[PDB]
Every structure is written in structure tokens, then in C-alpha cells.
Design a binder for these strands. Structure first.
Length: 209
DNA sequence: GGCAGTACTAGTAAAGTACTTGAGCTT
């Protein structure tokens, strides 16, 4: 029902605000924590023939270092999406000059649309998110340790300390849901901090390939 | 004384996985 659908959209928006917060983009403390009834009073209850149409849930956010980069979050209204639709989205992207955006897909993507997401690396990068993947925050699960995406200088000092080539580190594939969660690209290194029952804390470094 | 036939001696035929493949559905 519209109560269930609205509750889903609340989960999704909140989880995407946690996404946006973990990537270092400016988020007010209210944007992270919205009680369901405050969200409903804002966006008006029922989606079906209702106030939220899945449009105006779109999100624009700015980076802490520079305001220019920003970001974007689309919510498509179609069950499945295609090259023409994404092409409209990238038209809005080039209209606003914002480089980075997301897409929350209700069901699936035609493979030509995925390939069309991989087509253009430099101009605009788009990341497919399924609707369910944002219905839960996996970083807050007990098994998933704290991840910290390392800057290039910290990576250089790291490889200087242990005298390591980049190939000799353990790896984490770019299709890993956590790597998606932080929006990580090939060649970056992630710093996992996990508690151990021998030392009490242990640091892993996973190269992204 | 010669020819034919027979015999003997010397070559000679549970489950579980990955992988692939065919079909079925879409730009």
C-alpha cells in the first residue's frame, strides 16, 4: 500500500543521506535524521496519485572541500530504464554542469543502459543502485568493519613504510557492495579497521581492482 | 619326381563441479 511504499521511500532517502554523509558531502544533521512523520509531512503521504511522484525526491548535495562538485540522486519513475531515459538524465547533468550522479532503480536495467553507464568515464559518472540495496545500510551491520577511503598521500606513505608495490596488497573488487557504498574506483586503497580478539584492533589495506 | 595339402612357427589385433551450448527476450 501507499503506507508501505512511503515507508520504503523513507528508508531509501535516509540511506542515501547516509551515503552522501559517508562520502564527505555536506549534510545538515536534520537531513540524516528525519522521523517518518516529519518526512511524510514534508513530501505529503501517499505516492499513488499522491504528492511524491518519485520526482522531487531527487537530491542535490555539495562537497565539503569545494561546493562546485556537488552530486545528484535521481529516482526514476519507470520499473525498468533505458538508454533514452538515462540520456535525458545526462542532459540534465550537462545542463547543471554537475559531474557526479546516482540512479535508484526499482527493478533492473537493460544491458545497453549499463554499457551506456560505462561508456562515458570522464564527463559524467553514473552508478546503478537497486532499490533494495538502499533499503538497508550495510555499513551498520556487525560483520562489516569500518571502512576509510585513503587519500593518495596516505597511500604513498603506506607503500613507503612497508616498502610495498601496489600489486602486493590484498584486493577488493569494484563490484563489492561496500565499494559501491563509498563510490570507489580502480586504483584506490581502502583502510579497514576491525577489532580482533588477539590484538584488539587490526588494520587491513585493500587495493581496489 | 612333382604337386598339393596339412601342420607348425612367426608376425600381429556417487556428487559435484565447471564448461559449453542453445534458446529465449529484448533495442
Amino acid at each position: 500500500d501507499d503506507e508501505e511504499e512511503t515507508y520504503r521511500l523513507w528508508k531509501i532517502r535516509k540511506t542515501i543521506m547516509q551515503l552522501c554523509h559517508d562520502r564527505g558531502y555536506l549534510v545538515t544533521q536534520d537531513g540524516l535524521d528525519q522521523t517518518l512523520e516529519e518526512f511524510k509531512a514534508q513530501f505529503g503521504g501517499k505516492p499513488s496519485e499522491g504528492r511524491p511522484r518519485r520526482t522531487d525526491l531527487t537530491v542535490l548535495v555539495a562537497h565539503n572541500d569545494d561546493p562546485t562538485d556537488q552530486m545528484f540522486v535521481f529516482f526514476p519513475e519507470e520499473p525498468k530504464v533505458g538508454i533514452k531515459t538515462i540520456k535525458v538524465y545526462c542532459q540534465r547533468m550537462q545542463e547543471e554542469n554537475i559531474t557526479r550522479a546516482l540512479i535508484v532503480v526499482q527493478q533492473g536495467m537493460t544491458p545497453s543502459a549499463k554499457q551506456s553507464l560505462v561508456d562515458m568515464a570522464p564527463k559524467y559518472i553514473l552508478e546503478q543502485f537497486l532499490q533494495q540495496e538502499l533499503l538497508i545500510n550495510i555499513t551498520e551491520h556487525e560483520l562489516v568493519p569500518e571502512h576509510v577511503v585513503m587519500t593518495k598521500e596516505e597511500v604513498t606513505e603506506l607503500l613507503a613504510r612497508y616498502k610495498l608495490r601496489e600489486n602486493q596488497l590484498p584486493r577488493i573488487q569494484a563490484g563489492d557492495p561496500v565499494a559501491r557504498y563509498f563510490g570507489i574506483k580502480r586504483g584506490q586503497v581502502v583502510k579497514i579497521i576491525r577489532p580482533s580478539e588477539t590484538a584488539g584492533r587490526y588494520i587491513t589495506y585493500r587495493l581496489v581492482q
